[PDB]
């Protein structure tokens, strides 16, 4: 849940 689309 580190930001990545």
């Amino acid at each position: 849940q580190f930001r990545h689309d």
Partner: antibody, heavy 123, light 113 residues
Framework: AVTLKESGPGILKPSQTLSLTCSFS??????????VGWIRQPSGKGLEWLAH???????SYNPSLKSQLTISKDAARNQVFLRITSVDTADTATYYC???????????????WGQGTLVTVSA | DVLMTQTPLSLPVSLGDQASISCRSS???????????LEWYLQKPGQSPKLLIY???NRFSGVPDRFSGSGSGTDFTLKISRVEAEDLGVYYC?????????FGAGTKLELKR
């Protein structure tokens, strides 16, 4: 042409507040999906991620240092800042500014790193 | 935290040798979006780290094809097909999937004598 330039105080004493600045060009932090962060390396040791900040004001921190860290930005001036309160000799390191986007097109990787700013902490 | 274990931490080679570095994660590096954000970095003495490989096996622009990355899950490898002098330095694996983002301790590619 992407550039990343870090600046800091060079030397600081334990308990003091480290303020670092990354000034960049050739991309905008207001661009959808863009982010900029900081990684550090205590001289002769390995690499430690500190914080990242996104185009939309969302932020991510290393939990070990959560109480000591603040990442912020001035997107209009092309600047990202990191603040570290209550520093100690353990925070002696080269601090790097890195670019990292959360979208595949903009670059989801640490491709661009500054040259790094050396910070020594001692009384 | 996701511990990234590199094997070996020091690797003696002669120029021309094939070279392999293992990186193992303590949990899965697969993001909920389905990508595996495993990256390999090279730091040559006195320089900042350089991206070599992202997402397990993608070579970054300008990186020589003698470098390749493979693996899946918790088990990853960097291979150099023929080590050149410019390749010597410290290799880190890195996972960008879980907070905190974490690097391996570093594997020093050094010369055999």
């Amino acid at each position: 042409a992407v550039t990343l330039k870090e600046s800091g105080p060079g030397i600081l004493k334990p308990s003091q507040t480290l303020s670092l600045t990354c000034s960049f060009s050739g991309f905008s932090l207001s661009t959808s999906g863009m982010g900029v962060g900081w990684i550090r390396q205590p001289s002769g040791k390995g690499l430690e991620w500190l914080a990242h900040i996104w185009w939309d004001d969302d932020r991510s921190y290393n939990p070990s240092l959560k109480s000591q860290l603040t990442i912020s930005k001035d997107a209009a001036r092309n600047q990202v800042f990191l603040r570290i309160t209550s520093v100690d000799t353990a925070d002696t390191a080269t601090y790097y500014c890195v670019r990292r986007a959360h979208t595949t097109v903009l670059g989801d990787w640490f491709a661009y790193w500054g040259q790094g700013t050396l910070v020594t902490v001692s009384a | 935290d996701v511990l990234m274990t590199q094997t070996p931490l020091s690797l003696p080679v002669s120029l021309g040798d094939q070279a392999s570095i293992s990186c193992r994660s303590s949990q899965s590096i697969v993001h909920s979006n389905g990508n595996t954000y495993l990256e390999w970095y090279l730091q040559k003495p006195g320089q900042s780290p350089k991206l070599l490989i992202y997402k397990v096996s993608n070579r970054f622009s300008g990186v020589p094809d003698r470098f390749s990355g493979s693996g899946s899950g918790t088990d990853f490898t960097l291979k150099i097909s023929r080590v050149e002098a410019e390749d010597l330095g410290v290799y880190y694996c890195f996972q960008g999937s879980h907070v905190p983002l974490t690097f391996g301790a570093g594997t020093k590619l050094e010369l055999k004598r």
